[PDB]
Design a protein around this nucleic acid. Structure first.
Ligand SMILES: [Mg+2]
Ligand SMILES: [Mg+2]
Ligand SMILES: [Mg+2]
Ligand SMILES: [Mg+2]
Ligand SMILES: [Mg+2]
Ligand SMILES: [Mg+2]
Ligand SMILES: [Mg+2]
Ligand SMILES: [Mg+2]
Ligand SMILES: [Mg+2]
Ligand SMILES: [Mg+2]
Ligand SMILES: [Mg+2]
Ligand SMILES: [Mg+2]
Ligand SMILES: [Mg+2]
Ligand SMILES: [Mg+2]
Ligand SMILES: [Mg+2]
Ligand SMILES: [Mg+2]
Ligand SMILES: [Mg+2]
Ligand SMILES: [Mg+2]
Ligand SMILES: [Mg+2]
Ligand SMILES: [Mg+2]
Ligand SMILES: [Mg+2]
Ligand SMILES: [Mg+2]
Ligand SMILES: [Mg+2]
Ligand SMILES: [Mg+2]
Ligand SMILES: [Mg+2]
Ligand SMILES: [Mg+2]
Ligand SMILES: [Mg+2]
Ligand SMILES: [Mg+2]
Ligand SMILES: [Mg+2]
Ligand SMILES: [Mg+2]
Ligand SMILES: [Mg+2]
Ligand SMILES: [Mg+2]
Ligand SMILES: [Mg+2]
Ligand SMILES: [Mg+2]
Ligand SMILES: [Mg+2]
Ligand SMILES: [Mg+2]
Ligand SMILES: [Mg+2]
Ligand SMILES: [Mg+2]
Ligand SMILES: [Mg+2]
Ligand SMILES: [Mg+2]
Ligand SMILES: [Mg+2]
Ligand SMILES: [Mg+2]
Ligand SMILES: [Mg+2]
Ligand SMILES: [Mg+2]
Ligand SMILES: [Mg+2]
Ligand SMILES: [Mg+2]
Ligand SMILES: [Mg+2]
Ligand SMILES: [Mg+2]
Ligand SMILES: [Mg+2]
Ligand SMILES: [Mg+2]
Ligand SMILES: [Mg+2]
Ligand SMILES: [Mg+2]
Ligand SMILES: [Mg+2]
Ligand SMILES: [Mg+2]
Ligand SMILES: [Mg+2]
Ligand SMILES: [Mg+2]
Ligand SMILES: [Mg+2]
Ligand SMILES: [Mg+2]
Ligand SMILES: [Mg+2]
Ligand SMILES: [Mg+2]
Lengths: 202, 63
RNA sequence: GCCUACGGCCACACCACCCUGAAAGUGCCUGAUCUCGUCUGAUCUCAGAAGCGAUACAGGGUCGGGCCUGGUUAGUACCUGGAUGGGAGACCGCCUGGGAAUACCAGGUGUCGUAGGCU
RNA sequence: ACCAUCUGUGGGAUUAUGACUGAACGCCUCUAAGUCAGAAUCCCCCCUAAACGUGACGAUAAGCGCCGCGGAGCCU
RNA sequence: GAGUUUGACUGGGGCGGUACACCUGUCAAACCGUAACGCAGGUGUCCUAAGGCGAGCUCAGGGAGGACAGAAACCUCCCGUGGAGCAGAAGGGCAAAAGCUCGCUUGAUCUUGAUUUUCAGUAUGAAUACAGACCGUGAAAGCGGGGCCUCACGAUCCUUCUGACUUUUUGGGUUUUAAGCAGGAGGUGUCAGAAAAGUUACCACAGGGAUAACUGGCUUGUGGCGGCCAAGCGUUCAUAGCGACGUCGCUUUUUGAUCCUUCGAUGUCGGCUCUUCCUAUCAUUGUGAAGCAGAAUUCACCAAGCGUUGGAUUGUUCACCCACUAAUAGGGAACGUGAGCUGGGUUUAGACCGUCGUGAGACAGGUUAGUUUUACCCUACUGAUGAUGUGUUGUCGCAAUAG
RNA sequence: GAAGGCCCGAGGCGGGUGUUGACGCGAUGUGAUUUCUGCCCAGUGCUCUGAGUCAAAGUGAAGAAAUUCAAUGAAGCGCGGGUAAACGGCAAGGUAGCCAAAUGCCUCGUCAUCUAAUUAGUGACGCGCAUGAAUGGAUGAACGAGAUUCCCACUGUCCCUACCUACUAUCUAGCGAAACCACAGCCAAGGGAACGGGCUUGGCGGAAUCAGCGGGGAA
RNA sequence: UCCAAGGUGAACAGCCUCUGGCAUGUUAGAACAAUGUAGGUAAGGGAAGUCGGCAAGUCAGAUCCGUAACUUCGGGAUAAG
RNA sequence: UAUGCCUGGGCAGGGCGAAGCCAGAGGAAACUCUGGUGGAGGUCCGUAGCGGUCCUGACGUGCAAAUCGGUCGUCCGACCUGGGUAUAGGGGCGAAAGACUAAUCGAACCAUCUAGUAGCUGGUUCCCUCCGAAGUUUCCCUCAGGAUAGCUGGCGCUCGUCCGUCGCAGUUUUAUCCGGUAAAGCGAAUGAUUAGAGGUACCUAUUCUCAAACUUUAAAUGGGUAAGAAGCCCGGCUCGCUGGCUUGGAGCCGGGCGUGGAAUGCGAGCACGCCUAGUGGGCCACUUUUGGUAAGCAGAACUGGCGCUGCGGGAUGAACCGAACGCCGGGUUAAGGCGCCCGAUGCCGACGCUCAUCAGACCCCAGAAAAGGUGUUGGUUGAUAUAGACAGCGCCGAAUCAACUAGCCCUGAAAAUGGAUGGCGCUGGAGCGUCGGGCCCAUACCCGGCCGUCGCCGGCGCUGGGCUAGGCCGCG
């Protein structure tokens, strides 16, 4: 295919696979969660993200290659069931390609591939694991940067795993029955529902 | 031998060259498109308006 | 305090469930001779007043759903105008002004007019 | 007429690189200061040309050159 | 045989398409408007009701049920904001409606003017709100002069039909006929509306760089070339030599895209000849590295000084093969080089064959024969006189600088 | 078969073939000889027959008449037959032959031969893009300023140039044009209508000329 | 269009001469550079040149011999050697 | 010249050698063979003649508007040629090349129609003053062109022209509406989509990522209207419309009331009158935006600009920055500059950063990336250490180490004539960043002179000069 230099910038409007854009091939990346996904929230407290710094288009080919490069290092350094990689960029923007060139007469091209439009400060790939595996996530996410264009920086989030709550408050909300784990994440329990649900918790 | 299709580039300058002019507001605007039944009775109100000219002079004297 | 007929605004009025309801009213309820309409007096139209508050209806309740209002998100995102600003670029900062929306949190939950009527 | 015959050349700084001494950085280190070797490359010699560049020197016609602050004047 | 015609748009033209008359969503950047051979679709119809009105009714789907009967037949109940339907594309609108069903109907009728939209604010088409008639419907209020709204259509001339009247039919009168007024229809889809097949290399003219083919210029998809990351290969060992999945560049010796320069003309392919240049070094010089014992070879560095040949076939560049060789490296210079050549190719007119066309002819299909013009002008370069100012003149030298 | 075929002609008792008469004249195709000349009459065209369409004139009918209507109704068309050494195709499905050809796109087909080496040549192979039988197929002695391949011989075509001669060029006397020409004439780079000679920044630049030269003047 | 000498030779070929005619073709002198046009030679190799034996060269007259493949029986044929 | 006809002329020397004939042979016969003779033919070599192959030779402003040389075809035949005749332009003639028909032929020549037409090229002649464009809308067998609207100019005309009042506006303010773009949302509808969990493949509660032809929400900018006398207030009249009823509605009449009822600027009106030229190829930039890998690409929105425009600056250059222009003097600046070219720092400028064996040197703008560096300088977050670490061989005796990040430099970084921060050159800066003071000059700004135009409800008929009033004078 063409090099990623041709479809790196978000130059057109988002062109998703819809009833009007038919004939789109299947994306290269199909699995977004790797490792031990069916793990409790207390299993993997630490989480690290691959935050982007460019407003560009990451190809599904680069999303799959960076997924394998990060998985092959977490398996070799943290075991096959000691992490959970979640790719947080689904390729929805379809790329078009013109015919193998009467030159520009009817130049609207046919679908070529799919990219994921990333924003400045948006997470690309997230890895949660034990706290002592902090340096392994930084290196696993660093090796996957070379499989991506542009500039990305590795950030260790203050949240507890893949949840949206800080690690400092997570322990307190668990004791107060405000957070209950449901598989990979937790459910926020407000005080604004029927009281029967409150009796079931306690 | 293609050419340009549509352009409104220099048209705002041409429009404001002499200024966008609104029609001069005239008292007693034109009564075109009004209800014909309404126009019939309004013509009869003005046709027989002089019939009460004597009562108008009498009532003005009371003031 | 409450109930009718007609309404205006059209969920703060809706929905689920539970509790309670004087008096009148409303409804249920009782019949098919006539009016009228159905496969069938269930509906509809008509005739009526033995029975009760079951339901409708109204009021109240729910750490109720929704809805409504406000806070928060946030001067965040976005944006007018400006620069011989930065950067290879992608884009970003500043100047001049303008300025959001979810999640989250809190509060509220019909109201008004006309006419007649009951405590 | 390689179809006969003859001739075709020396250095300099250095590139790459390998090193010396030696810190930074108690050690180490070709490098940071300072040194060495270093090439069909580069510059130069050799070689061809000789500048609105030139040196030495010879001879320089009734004309002509030096020597009298020639001794006075006219044009630039 | 004569005359004429053989649309336009168009990333040249033709072929294709209709972006040529219309409609929906979007593009369109929150009034409207807004382009491209932008995107996704629709249209030349359909309807005596699918028009109009009134009345009743409620849909899609789901749950629970009920002989045959089942995942889908029909009956019943409950939930059901419409998730159904409304002729069609789409959007909007719509629930005791605009849907479904039923019974009465023909406002889809006869008229005048105004208004909206496309707009020049012209026409047509399609709409809006009245008014005057005559009706439909409902108990009535009302509603209705077509379809819930946004598309579903046509000038002059001519023909035809209907209607009206102190209308004409020419010196009067009568009856035919013809003409006129007014309203429909017969149609121009190139849809504001000529009556229209080619071919031309035997071609001609007006022009056009508004516009193609050849160079240059922008671009680098493609081509070529080079990094980065390290799965893996290398018996073992990621990086001696390699580099999958990815990714970042460079080049203008491929091709494409574009159409800016040139159509009162820049001679256009290759070869021959000849000079200089580039390095992304094949060989030679000096090195580093190895999965370097030697030999041979591979990788890399300084590096373009020097060299890179002779032939068969082909017009060919490009390939292929024969040998030779230290090696037989890659390119630019208007794809260097036609007032340097050579015309083989291509590229007029002759002719053959195949396919194609009824034909004339066409064919980047093959084949054969086919005029290659001018320098004495200016620079450049090659040499040849001479010019330069120190008096003239001559000999013997120096030497910048260039090679 | 002449009252004709063919053709000329504005026109006639016009004229040509024709001073002719089928062993003739006129119109075409193929192209000596030898050897064969296959299939298709649907389409187009020609030609030959006797059972819907069919002009003017004529006849009939209605009407005051104009007019209208009706019947009749030529050739030609339509219908039918024949015809391909007619156009053509292979309605018939390419027969005999021939071929990678002057005809084969793929293609520099495959094989053999020809050479150290062959996109060439020849002989073969043929589902042949798209050969083929008087749109003639196949062959073929002799012939050809025809295209092509090889061999012998020969040769400065070449390796690799050299030398000689004649006329030019050259110089002089006499004589003496033309094309061409905005101004003109040393370059590099930059920008520019994207290849300057002139502008920009640099390199720099010395009278007047001779013989050459073919880079440039997009001569 | 007409007339057409001698020699050589098969020849009205080519070459030389006689009769007759002419002054080198709209100029001369000097020089002998390049490059041309025309003519010629070249050792050794012999088409390696080139799209291609282009151009050039080889062969040539006559006499005596010798003459195939193929053929339409005529030829090929001046085969070739 | 093409062809037919008529009447004439001309065509060496040789080669092979056909029918007929003669003779001699062979044979049982039929018949065959040999020698000679003969001199046939769209025969062969070849001269003249007639042709014109190759050299793609010479020449190619030539000898020549088709020739010359060598070579070459044919040369008893469908041969060559003179003369006389025949055929004439849409015709002739053609052994066929669209050949030839007087240097002219895929339709000759001559004169006329004819100054044929051209939406197409070229050109279009004195000065000055003043104003000044358009490449866009609709329609067109249109798309190199017209018609039309717009933009332009001319000619005016109706008024106003101290405050005041009318009237006006590419602008704010106030009041009130409109919209569905950015953003957001999809634990909300439609559509797309990830992972578990719970209850029993679904189902509930969560979770990841999205929309241009999705949306509950929803800006900024933006669009419309209004901000008074054409009003307000009081009292009556008309009507055939409206109707329970002066009940509406609209029109008219009389009287009363400026604090003109937001800010600012400004003279307006006449369907912005009447006639009207040119244009209807545009192009470029910020932002927005479509196709395209991209383009000095194609196509839009908005505004400015170029075209129509010079000037200062960017070396240079249609568009960038500044600023637009009568002719001058003085002054001051803009953008940009101040080592020298080249006007200005010849300041005892300030603080740091940086060494580059391809340093770097500033809008548009005219070559760089990913990835690296134990070059150097900052910063961030950690970790060891005087119960003695780091490094080096218990000794040593003071801090040290790791990761990450950011400046400059460096690697990555290869093109062809010799060359481009503009050049020279610059390294205690003439480099990069942050600033200060001073200084340099544009046709810009200020003041002054002169010229012209334009505007003054301009002045003067009341004379030393004056008033050609179509003159003179004054002001901006
Ligand atoms: Mg245009
Ligand atoms: Mg168009
Ligand atoms: Mg609630
Ligand atoms: Mg809120
Ligand atoms: Mg070193
Ligand atoms: Mg040394
Ligand atoms: Mg014609
Ligand atoms: Mg066209
Ligand atoms: Mg809009
Ligand atoms: Mg009506
Ligand atoms: Mg152009
Ligand atoms: Mg590539
Ligand atoms: Mg790869
Ligand atoms: Mg190199
Ligand atoms: Mg060769
Ligand atoms: Mg070339
Ligand atoms: Mg040339
Ligand atoms: Mg030439
Ligand atoms: Mg050439
Ligand atoms: Mg040729
Ligand atoms: Mg030809
Ligand atoms: Mg035939
Ligand atoms: Mg037939
Ligand atoms: Mg066959
Ligand atoms: Mg050969
Ligand atoms: Mg063959
Ligand atoms: Mg046949
Ligand atoms: Mg021949
Ligand atoms: Mg020039
Ligand atoms: Mg030329
Ligand atoms: Mg002579
Ligand atoms: Mg020789
Ligand atoms: Mg050869
Ligand atoms: Mg020859
Ligand atoms: Mg032979
Ligand atoms: Mg012969
Ligand atoms: Mg001859
Ligand atoms: Mg000749
Ligand atoms: Mg020639
Ligand atoms: Mg010449
Ligand atoms: Mg011959
Ligand atoms: Mg004659
Ligand atoms: Mg004539
Ligand atoms: Mg022809
Ligand atoms: Mg002026
Ligand atoms: Mg304009
Ligand atoms: Mg033009
Ligand atoms: Mg105009
Ligand atoms: Mg016009
Ligand atoms: Mg034009
Ligand atoms: Mg553009
Ligand atoms: Mg263009
Ligand atoms: Mg112009
Ligand atoms: Mg202007
Ligand atoms: Mg510049
Ligand atoms: Mg001044
Ligand atoms: Mg300067
Ligand atoms: Mg590296
Ligand atoms: Mg660098
Ligand atoms: Mg002034």
């Amino acid at each position: 295919r063409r090099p990623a230099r041709c479809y790196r910038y978000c130059k057109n409007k988002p062109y998703p696979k819809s009833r009007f854009c038919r004939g789109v091939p299947d994306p290269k990346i199909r699995i977004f969660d790797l490792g031990r996904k069916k793990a409790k929230v207390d299993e993997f407290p630490l989480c690290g993200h691959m935050v982007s710094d460019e407003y560009e288009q990451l190809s599904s080919e680069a999303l799959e290659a960076a997924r394998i490069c990060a998985n092959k290092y977490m398996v070799k350094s943290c075991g096959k069931d000691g992490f959970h990689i979640r790719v947080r960029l689904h390729p929805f923007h379809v790329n078009r390609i013109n015919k193998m060139l009467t030159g520009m007469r009817g130049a609207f091209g046919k679908p070529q591939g799919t990219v994921a439009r990333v924003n400045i400060g948006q997470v690309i790939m997230s890895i949660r694991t034990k706290t002592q595996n902090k340096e392994h996530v930084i290196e696993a996410l660093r090796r996957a940067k070379f499989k991506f264009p542009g500039r990305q920086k590795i950030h260790i989030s203050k949240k507890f795993g893949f949840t949206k709550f800080n690690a400092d408050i997570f322990e307190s909300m668990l004791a107060e029955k405000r957070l209950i784990p449901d598989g990979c994440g937790v459910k926020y329990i407000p005080n604004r529902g029927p009281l029967d649900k409150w009796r079931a918790i306690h | 031998a293609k050419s340009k299709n549509h352009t409104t580039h220099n048209q705002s300058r041409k429009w404001h060259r002499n200024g966008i002019k609104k029609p001069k507001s005239q008292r007693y605007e034109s009564l075109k498109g009004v209800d014909p039944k309404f126009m019939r009775n309004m013509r009869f109100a003005k046709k027989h308006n002089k019939k009460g000219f004597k009562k108008m002079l009498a009532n003005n004297a009371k003031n």
